[PDB]
């Protein structure tokens, strides 16, 4: 149904959104 981060266990319904999340909460990818 949703997409969950490919680093942690976060869940989003869009892509741009999840990427944003990574940029600041992981700051390693992509
Ligand atoms: Zn994450």
Curated annotation (Swiss-Prot):
Transmembrane intervals: none
Zn finger (C2H2-type) start-end: 3-26
Subcellular location field: Nucleus
Family, similarity comment: Belongs to the krueppel C2H2-type zinc-finger protein family. ZFX/ZFY subfamily.
Entry domain remark: The binding of ZFY to DNA is mediated by the interaction of the GGCC core base pairs with zinc fingers 12 and 13.
Function: Probable transcriptional activator. Binds to the consensus sequence 5'-AGGCCY-3'.
Name of the protein in question: Zinc finger Y-chromosomal protein
Organism: Homo sapiens (Human)
């Amino acid at each position: 149904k949703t997409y969950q981060c490919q680093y942690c266990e976060a869940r989003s319904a869009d892509s741009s959104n999840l990427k944003t999340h990574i940029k600041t909460k992981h700051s390693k990818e992509k």
